[PDB]
Design a protein around this motif. Structure first.
Motif, PDB file in Angstrom:
ATOM      1  N   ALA A  29       0.672  -0.963   0.134  1.00 30.73           N
ATOM      2  CA  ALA A  29       0.187   0.096  -0.377  1.00 30.73           C
ATOM      3  C   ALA A  29       0.686   1.191  -0.459  1.00 30.73           C
ATOM      4  N   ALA A  30       2.239   0.684  -0.099  1.00 33.58           N
ATOM      5  CA  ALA A  30       2.906   2.284   0.177  1.00 33.58           C
ATOM      6  C   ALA A  30       3.059   2.545  -1.103  1.00 33.58           C
ATOM      7  N   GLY A  31       3.345   2.096  -2.325  1.00 27.86           N
ATOM      8  CA  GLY A  31       3.143   2.437  -3.986  1.00 27.86           C
ATOM      9  C   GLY A  31       4.656   2.572  -3.448  1.00 27.86           C
ATOM     10  N   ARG A  32       5.838   2.346  -2.722  1.00 28.36           N
ATOM     11  CA  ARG A  32       7.370   2.919  -2.817  1.00 28.36           C
ATOM     12  C   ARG A  32       7.605   1.050  -3.098  1.00 28.36           C
ATOM     13  N   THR A  33       8.504   0.997  -4.120  1.00 31.99           N
ATOM     14  CA  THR A  33       9.471  -0.374  -4.198  1.00 31.99           C
ATOM     15  C   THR A  33      10.837  -0.049  -4.022  1.00 31.99           C
ATOM     16  N   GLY A  34      11.371  -1.970  -3.406  1.00 28.62           N
ATOM     17  CA  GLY A  34      12.301  -2.115  -2.937  1.00 28.62           C
ATOM     18  C   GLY A  34      11.506  -2.573  -1.819  1.00 28.62           C
ATOM     19  N   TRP A  35      10.361  -2.983  -1.464  1.00 28.20           N
ATOM     20  CA  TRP A  35       9.931  -3.316   0.503  1.00 28.20           C
ATOM     21  C   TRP A  35      10.285  -4.771   0.332  1.00 28.20           C
ATOM     22  N   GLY A  82      21.875   3.412  -0.215  1.00 30.36           N
ATOM     23  CA  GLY A  82      22.263   4.202   0.695  1.00 30.36           C
ATOM     24  C   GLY A  82      21.851   4.759   1.980  1.00 30.36           C
ATOM     25  N   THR A  83      20.495   4.184   1.461  1.00 31.98           N
ATOM     26  CA  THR A  83      19.052   5.273   2.688  1.00 31.98           C
ATOM     27  C   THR A  83      19.199   4.418   3.994  1.00 31.98           C
ATOM     28  N   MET A  84      19.509   5.944   4.643  1.00 30.36           N
ATOM     29  CA  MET A  84      19.431   5.465   6.428  1.00 30.36           C
ATOM     30  C   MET A  84      18.531   5.616   7.074  1.00 30.36           C
ATOM     31  N   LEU A  85      17.966   4.540   7.662  1.00 32.81           N
ATOM     32  CA  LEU A  85      16.577   4.179   8.138  1.00 32.81           C
ATOM     33  C   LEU A  85      16.473   2.931   9.653  1.00 32.81           C
ATOM     34  N   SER A  86      15.324   3.681   9.877  1.00 34.43           N
ATOM     35  CA  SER A  86      15.232   2.553  11.310  1.00 34.43           C
ATOM     36  C   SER A  86      13.722   2.222  11.480  1.00 34.43           C
ATOM     37  N   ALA A  87      14.219   0.964  12.042  1.00 32.01           N
ATOM     38  CA  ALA A  87      13.272  -0.025  12.333  1.00 32.01           C
ATOM     39  C   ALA A  87      12.637  -0.759  13.753  1.00 32.01           C
ATOM     40  N   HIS A  88      11.395  -1.259  14.395  1.00 37.19           N
ATOM     41  CA  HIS A  88      11.582  -1.431  15.487  1.00 37.19           C
ATOM     42  C   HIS A  88      10.880  -3.260  15.105  1.00 37.19           C
ATOM     43  N   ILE A 110       8.175  -2.637  12.152  1.00 38.27           N
ATOM     44  CA  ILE A 110       7.983  -0.947  11.602  1.00 38.27           C
ATOM     45  C   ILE A 110       8.701  -0.531  11.344  1.00 38.27           C
ATOM     46  N   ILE A 111       8.447   0.239  10.288  1.00 37.15           N
ATOM     47  CA  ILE A 111       9.555   1.047   9.663  1.00 37.15           C
ATOM     48  C   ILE A 111       9.442   2.464  10.127  1.00 37.15           C
ATOM     49  N   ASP A 112      10.594   2.959  10.082  1.00 37.32           N
ATOM     50  CA  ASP A 112      10.731   4.392  10.318  1.00 37.32           C
ATOM     51  C   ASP A 112      11.709   5.338  10.229  1.00 37.32           C
ATOM     52  N   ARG A 113      11.420   6.510   9.167  1.00 35.02           N
ATOM     53  CA  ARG A 113      12.317   6.814   8.149  1.00 35.02           C
ATOM     54  C   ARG A 113      12.625   8.431   9.243  1.00 35.02           C
ATOM     55  N   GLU A 114      13.920   7.845   9.446  1.00 39.23           N
ATOM     56  CA  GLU A 114      14.686   9.758  10.571  1.00 39.23           C
ATOM     57  C   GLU A 114      14.313  10.777   9.420  1.00 39.23           C
ATOM     58  N   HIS A 115      14.553  11.359   8.087  1.00 35.53           N
ATOM     59  CA  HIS A 115      14.213  12.444   7.524  1.00 35.53           C
ATOM     60  C   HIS A 115      13.265  12.245   6.252  1.00 35.53           C
ATOM     61  N   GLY A 117      12.269  11.623   3.016  1.00 37.43           N
ATOM     62  CA  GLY A 117      12.329  10.574   1.974  1.00 37.43           C
ATOM     63  C   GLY A 117      10.864  10.108   1.560  1.00 37.43           C
ATOM     64  N   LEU A 118      10.652  10.887   0.989  1.00 37.68           N
ATOM     65  CA  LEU A 118       9.172  10.771  -0.237  1.00 37.68           C
ATOM     66  C   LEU A 118       8.587  11.115  -0.513  1.00 37.68           C
ATOM     67  N   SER A 119       9.664  11.987  -1.602  1.00 36.87           N
ATOM     68  CA  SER A 119       9.047  12.695  -2.844  1.00 36.87           C
ATOM     69  C   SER A 119       8.276  12.311  -3.772  1.00 36.87           C
ATOM     70  N   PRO A 120       7.541  13.400  -4.968  1.00 33.93           N
ATOM     71  CA  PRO A 120       6.353  12.379  -5.312  1.00 33.93           C
ATOM     72  C   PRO A 120       6.918  11.689  -6.802  1.00 33.93           C
TER      73      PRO A 120
END
Lengths: 132, 32
Positions: A29-35, A82-88, A110-115, A117-120
């Protein structure tokens, strides 16, 4: 935090502590590949041994098995981009009452993005042969 | 009795990489 989001997934473990399957319907449902990349990376770190100590998954296992519920801290990882993301991750013991099956362990991630990073960039497809 | 009590194995060993890709694909049947 809060109940705002979607980028996440869950895991299903049998009475043998093994992975029987994984639920990533949310990521779809995120519509973002690379899951798949984020799922494997996160899982790799969660099951990764903390130095001389056992992996986080183990800690949550004994906790969810002795308490019935456990949750690991927020870990950081780098994606293929190279994207830095944290999750639990959290483990929850579940035993079947109706069906004559065995209890399984549900692990929610659960995924948690620091900065931000979800542009159109919703424009991967367009053609195929000869549309209208 | 309780299974998870010790059925989940105290060692807890993670997968390799072929189990994640398979469970991630899903489908049950494999068209083909």
């Amino acid at each position: 935090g809060h109940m705002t989001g979607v980028e996440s997934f869950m895991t299903k473990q049998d009475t043998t502590g093994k992975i029987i399957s994984i639920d990533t319907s949310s990521l779809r449902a995120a519509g973002r590949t690379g899951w798949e990349d984020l799922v494997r990376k996160c899982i790799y770190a969660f099951f990764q041994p903390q130095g001389r100590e056992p992996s986080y998954a183990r800690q949550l296992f004994q906790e969810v098995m002795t308490r019935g519920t456990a949750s690991s801290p927020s870990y950081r990882f780098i994606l293929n981009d190279g994207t830095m993301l944290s999750a639990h991750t959290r483990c929850k013991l579940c035993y079947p009452q109706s069906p004559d099956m065995q209890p399984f362990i549900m692990g929610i991630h659960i995924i948690d993005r620091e900065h931000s990073g979800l542009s159109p960039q919703d424009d991967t497809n367009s053609g195929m042969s000869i549309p209208r | 009795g309780t299974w998870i009590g010790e059925d989940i194995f105290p060692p807890l060993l993670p997968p390799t990489e072929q189990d994640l890709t398979k469970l991630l694909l899903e489908g049950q049947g494999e068209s083909g």
